[PDB]
């Protein structure tokens, strides 16, 4: 169950400032480049 | 999960057969693992690092020993493991050639000087 | 201390006069001898007035340092850095029950201190390749001792070590170190080098057959020390060539093809040119001691006439106690060598027509 | 700090590694976590950086006195020898992002082969400036050190030399 | 004092720069602690005292181009050996989060022999080039130690190219 | 028994069967010391 969950792919969007494990958590997206819901 | 079904999973892993096709091997497995559900010796993770070194020099695969010298640091650097002795001792126990004596070389601490 | 500087030059002079173009043969520089921290065996309040269960942990800790050669802080190794001797001064106030056992643990330290100097001294060029290899194989067991004491340090670190347990742990290493120290004393005492320190090791290897705990230690040291000699042997047997950089070999070459050419009044090639040495026989080839010379001499006196070098099969040989395979191989090669020389003699430049026309 | 060093290696040192016109990257700043003797280690490393800094100026002017087309070719091969010096700098910061426990020693052994590459090419660069080697005699002045005797300088000056031969097949095509 | 600060110092006196409470005051002498610990330190610091000679000589002769190509080749081989020493020191730095065994007395032991031999060779081959230099390296394979023969025989294959 | 073992290894004329006899006079001291060690562990006895 734990090892079954283990086999996944970890995200990119690496950060320079994280030296202790930087996989990725999105350093604040752009306003237009989240469209079709931000638009309305 | 629970250990007893986990050993059956091991038996279905190495053998190609399923668990409803073999029962003597699982019976032999409960015979051998039983009353040995913990190490009977004391851990010396330093020596089992030295035994992979002493093995890879003995094969004259001396570059992968110096590679292990950095992988062991990675083992310490992450630190999600509290049993580093068990898996590495086991991996050394299942030793296979990529392609002497240990009766004078030191063995694991047997606890014959302490009431177990 | 001073005595090591003597032995090397006396040993070196034999190879310096023996070599007639081999000038300025290698020796180690001076700081190898000046610096004393290259051997392993070169707060302070009295522990005896402490309670018992403090004393046992403290004494185990000090002796643990004494094993790997460095002094403690409550027991001191007395200054005796010369010969294979080393002395120790236990604390003058102690519980007598503890102190007797402490004295009992002490002998393996002396049979370590003698051992570590030998490895330094008889690996230098003046001591010869076999003496180098023997030192290289006892150094492995010294490294093994360094491996064991760290595990003892780890167990002591977790506060689970006392003197009775320590005595029980050191009993297997005491016998091993004893065999090594007696062998070291024997090798230096006869002042033997080359093939004589294959004879010593051959007799010492045969000596135990009842224990078999000590037979394997010496048998491994014999395999390691017999490695260079057997290679020189394979050179001599299978073609014709010896060099002998530091004397380990029974055959020596005394030239006499200076007085006269292509006549012999002595048959010097077949006689006093290639001769044997009694003391570089490793004392199990004494039966084969003539055949080993004749086999390689026959090849040189046919490679000189213009005939092609041949060996039946090139094989690598080891020392084996009880069932020799090397001897039977030597016999086949020896018969082939004599057959080739006789074959060459009886066909070309034949003896038949010579004897008829006489 | 794991970019400050990896830019003081390149061309931007800040105030920790103050540049001097003769030879720079001087350190006097104190830290409890950098060992008192580690200043000497960093001083050993900064020798590598100064040569790269001077190389960049020399390429900056090119690509009268000393001029020609060879200074616009010899500098271009000097780019190609510096390319595994840039790639191995990118690789470093990629490694340091993941593992924080790697020290100064990792950049030291890893880029130890440019402590034979950089001085023995730098002497050629200084020789061509102090002397007046700026015609087609440039191939000789490199052709004596391209034989080398240390393997990095044995391989680099060849890679620079091939382009200078390439200029020598355009003069000798128009002429011939 | 705690042991770990001393481990930090001894990891740098390998390079030939003194520690904080270990300093060398006589050049013939080795690095001295400034009580049982003090006795223990010296055998470990021997490797750095040996390291200074080899490093200084392969630093000097490599920049010397009147010395000749042969022996700049010797410096090449010596330099490639020193790089691996630095690999070891980096592993030892990084493994901090005891951890050392007899303050690394068992660790440094295998580099000690391959340091002793290379420390001998440089003054045995001092002031030589060409076949004169090559013969003094061929002298060192009259040895009968397997590890030393193995150490020498690749250096010779490099230098006589 | 320890007095004897201390002397028969001090004799190289006691035989190649004496250095076989003495082999189970080393084990017979080693197991004794093992037992004293286990007795030591349970001290902290009647």
UniProtKB/Swiss-Prot annotation, chain A:
Location in or out of the cell: Cytoplasm, Cytoskeleton, Microtubule organizing center, Centrosome
Similarity annotation: Belongs to the TUBGCP family.
Biological role stated in the UniProt entry: Component of the gamma-tubulin ring complex (gTuRC) which mediates microtubule nucleation. The gTuRC regulates the minus-end nucleation of alpha-beta tubulin heterodimers that grow into microtubule protafilaments, a critical step in centrosome duplication and spindle formation.
Disease the record associates with this protein: Microcephaly and chorioretinopathy, autosomal recessive, 1: A syndrome characterized by microcephaly, cognitive impairment, underdeveloped retina and choroid, and epilepsy in some patients. The more anterior parts of the retina, near the periphery and pars plana, have a grayish hue and diminutive vasculature similar to retinopathy of prematurity. Visual impairment becomes evident during the first year of life.
Protein name from the UniProt record: Gamma-tubulin complex component 6
Gene symbol of the encoding locus: TUBGCP6
Curated annotation (Swiss-Prot), chain B:
Domain of life: Eukaryota
Residues bearing PTM Phosphoserine: 100
Tissue expression notes: Ubiquitously expressed.
Name of the protein this chain belongs to: Gamma-tubulin complex component 3
Coiled coil: none
Annotated signal sequence range: none
Compartmental location: Cytoplasm, Cytoskeleton, Microtubule organizing center, Centrosome
Family listed: Belongs to the TUBGCP family.
Species, as recorded: Homo sapiens
Gene that specifies this protein: TUBGCP3
Self-association state and partner proteins as the record states: Component of the gamma-tubulin ring complex (gTuRC) consisting of TUBGCP2, TUBGCP3, TUBGCP4, TUBGCP5 and TUBGCP6 and gamma-tubulin TUBG1 or TUBG2. TUBGCP2, TUBGCP3, TUBGCP4, TUBGCP5 and TUBGCP6 assemble in a 5:5:2:1:1 stoichiometry; each is associated with a gamma-tubulin, thereby arranging 14 gamma-tubulins in a helical manner. Gamma-tubulin at the first position is blocked by TUBGCP3 at the last position, allowing 13 protafilaments to grow into a microtubule.
Role summary: Component of the gamma-tubulin ring complex (gTuRC) which mediates microtubule nucleation. The gTuRC regulates the minus-end nucleation of alpha-beta tubulin heterodimers that grow into microtubule protafilaments, a critical step in centrosome duplication and spindle formation.
Swiss-Prot record, chain C:
Known tissue expression: Ubiquitously expressed.
Subcellular localization: Cytoplasm, Cytoskeleton, Microtubule organizing center, Centrosome
Family from the record: Belongs to the TUBGCP family.
Oligomer and partners: Component of the gamma-tubulin ring complex (gTuRC) consisting of TUBGCP2, TUBGCP3, TUBGCP4, TUBGCP5 and TUBGCP6 and gamma-tubulin TUBG1 or TUBG2. TUBGCP2, TUBGCP3, TUBGCP4, TUBGCP5 and TUBGCP6 assemble in a 5:5:2:1:1 stoichiometry; each is associated with a gamma-tubulin, thereby arranging 14 gamma-tubulins in a helical manner. Gamma-tubulin at the first position is blocked by TUBGCP3 at the last position, allowing 13 protafilaments to grow into a microtubule.
Function: Component of the gamma-tubulin ring complex (gTuRC) which mediates microtubule nucleation. The gTuRC regulates the minus-end nucleation of alpha-beta tubulin heterodimers that grow into microtubule protafilaments, a critical step in centrosome duplication and spindle formation. Plays a role in neuronal migration.
Name of the molecule in the record: Gamma-tubulin complex component 2
Species per Swiss-Prot/TrEMBL record: Homo sapiens
Full protein: residues contained: 150 to 516 of 902
Swiss-Prot record, chain D:
Tissue expression from the record: Ubiquitously expressed.
Signal sequence extent: none
Compartments reported by the entry: Cytoplasm, Cytoskeleton, Microtubule organizing center, Centrosome
Family: Belongs to the TUBGCP family.
Summary of the function given for this chain in its UniProt record: Component of the gamma-tubulin ring complex (gTuRC) which mediates microtubule nucleation. The gTuRC regulates the minus-end nucleation of alpha-beta tubulin heterodimers that grow into microtubule protafilaments, a critical step in centrosome duplication and spindle formation.
Subunit structure: Component of the gamma-tubulin ring complex (gTuRC) consisting of TUBGCP2, TUBGCP3, TUBGCP4, TUBGCP5 and TUBGCP6 and gamma-tubulin TUBG1 or TUBG2. TUBGCP2, TUBGCP3, TUBGCP4, TUBGCP5 and TUBGCP6 assemble in a 5:5:2:1:1 stoichiometry; each is associated with a gamma-tubulin, thereby arranging 14 gamma-tubulins in a helical manner. Gamma-tubulin at the first position is blocked by TUBGCP3 at the last position, allowing 13 protafilaments to grow into a microtubule.
Protein name, entry field: Gamma-tubulin complex component 4
């Amino acid at each position: 169950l734990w090892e079954a969950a283990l086999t996944y792919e970890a995200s990119k969007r690496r950060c320079w400032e994280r030296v202790g494990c930087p996989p990725g958590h999105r350093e604040e997206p752009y306003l237009t480049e989240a469209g079709r819901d931000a638009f309305d | 999960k629970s250990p007893n079904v986990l050993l059956q999973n091991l038996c279905c892993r190495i053998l190609g057969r399923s668990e409803a096709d073999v029962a003597q091997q699982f019976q032999y497995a409960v015979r051998v693992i039983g009353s040995n559900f913990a190490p009977t010796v004391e851990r010396d993770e330093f020596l089992v690092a030295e035994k992979i070194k002493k093995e890879l020099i003995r094969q004259r695969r001396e570059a992968d020993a110096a590679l292990f010298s950095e992988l062991h640091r990675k083992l310490h650097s992450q630190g999600v493991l509290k049993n580093k002795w068990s898996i590495l001792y086991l991996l050394l126990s299942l030793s296979e050639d990529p392609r002497s004596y240990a009766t004078l070389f030191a063995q694991a601490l047997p606890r014959d000087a302490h009431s177990t | 201390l001073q005595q090591s500087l003597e032995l090397k030059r006396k040993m070196l002079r034999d190879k310096q006069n023996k070599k007639n173009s081999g000038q300025h043969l290698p020796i180690f520089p001076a700081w190898v001898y000046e610096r004393p921290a290259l051997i392993g065996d070169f707060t302070a309040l009295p522990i005896g007035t402490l309670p018992l269960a403090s004393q046992e942990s403290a004494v185990v800790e000090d002796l643990l340092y004494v094993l790997v050669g460095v002094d403690g802080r409550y027991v001191s190794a007395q200054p005796l850095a010369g010969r294979q001797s080393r002395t120790f001064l236990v604390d003058p106030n102690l519980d007598l029950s503890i102190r007797e056992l402490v004295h009992r643990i002490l002998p393996v330290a002396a049979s370590y201190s003698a051992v570590t100097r030998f490895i330094e001294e008889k690996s230098s060029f003046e001591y010869g390749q076999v003496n180098h290899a023997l030192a290289a194989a006892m150094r492995t067991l010294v490294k093994e001792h360094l491996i064991l004491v760290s595990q003892l340090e780890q167990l002591h670190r977790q506060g689970l070590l006392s003197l009775q347990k320590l005595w029980f742990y050191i009993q297997p290493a005491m016998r091993t170190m004893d065999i090594l120290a007696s062998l070291a004393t024997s090798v230096d005492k006869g002042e033997c080098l080359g093939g004589s320190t294959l004879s010593l090791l051959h007799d010492r290897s045969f000596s135990y057959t009842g224990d078999s705990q000590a037979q394997e230690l010496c048998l491994y040291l014999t395999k390691a020390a017999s490695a260079p000699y057997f290679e020189v042997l394979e050179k001599w047997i299978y073609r014709g060539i010896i060099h002998d950089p530091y004397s380990e070999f029974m055959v020596e070459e005394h030239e006499l093809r200076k007085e006269r050419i292509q006549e012999d009044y002595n048959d010097k090639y077949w006689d006093q040119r290639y001769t044997i040495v009694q003391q570089q026989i490793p004392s199990f080839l004494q039966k084969m001691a003539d055949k080993i010379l004749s086999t390689g001499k026959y090849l040189n006196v046919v490679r000189e006439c213009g005939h092609d070098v041949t060996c039946p099969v090139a094989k690598e040989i080891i020392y084996t106690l009880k069932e020799r395979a090397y001897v039977e191989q030597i016999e086949k090669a020896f018969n082939y060598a004599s057959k080739v020389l006789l074959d060459f003699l009886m066909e070309e430049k034949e003896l038949v027509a010579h004897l008829r026309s006489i | 700090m794991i970019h400050e060093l990896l830019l003081a290696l390149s061309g931007y040192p800040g105030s920790i590694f103050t540049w001097n016109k003769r030879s720079g990257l001087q350190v006097s700043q104190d830290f409890p976590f950098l060992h008192p003797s580690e200043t000497s280690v960093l001083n050993r490393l900064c020798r590598l950086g100064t040569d790269y800094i001077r190389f960049t100026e020399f390429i900056e002017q090119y690509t009268g006195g000393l001029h020609g087309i060879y200074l616009r070719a010899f500098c271009t091969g000097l780019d190609s020898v510096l390319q595994p010096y840039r790639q191995a700098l990118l690789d470093l910061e990629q490694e340091f992002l993941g593992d924080p426990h790697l020290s100064i020693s990792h950049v030291n052994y890893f880029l130890d082969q440019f402590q034979l590459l950089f001085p023995s090419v730098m002497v050629v660069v200084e020789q061509i400036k102090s002397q007046k080697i700026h015609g087609c005699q440039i191939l000789e002045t490199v052709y004596k050190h391209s034989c080398g005797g240390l393997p990095p300088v044995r391989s680099a000056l060849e890679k620079i030399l091939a382009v200078c031969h390439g200029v020598m097949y355009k003069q000798l095509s128009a002429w011939m | 004092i705690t042991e770990a600060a001393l481990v930090r110092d001894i990891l740098y006196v390998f390079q030939g720069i003194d520690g904080k409470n270990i300093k060398m005051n006589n050049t013939e002498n080795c690095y001295k602690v400034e009580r049982s610990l003090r006795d223990t330190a010296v055998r470990l610091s021997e490797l750095g005292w040996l390291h200074n000679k080899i490093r200084r000589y392969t630093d000097q002769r490599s920049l010397d181009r009147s010395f000749g190509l042969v022996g700049q080749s010797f410096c090449a081989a010596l330099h490639q050996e020193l790089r691996e020493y630095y690999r070891l020191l980096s592993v030892l730095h990084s493994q901090l989060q005891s951890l050392t065994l007899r303050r690394l007395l068992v660790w440094t032991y295998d580099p000690k022999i391959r340091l002793k031999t290379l420390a001998a060779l440089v003054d045995h081959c001092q002031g030589r080039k060409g076949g004169e230099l090559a013969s003094a390296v061929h002298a060192y394979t009259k040895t009968g130690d397997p590890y030393m023969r193995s150490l020498v025989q690749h250096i010779l294959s490099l230098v006589s190219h």
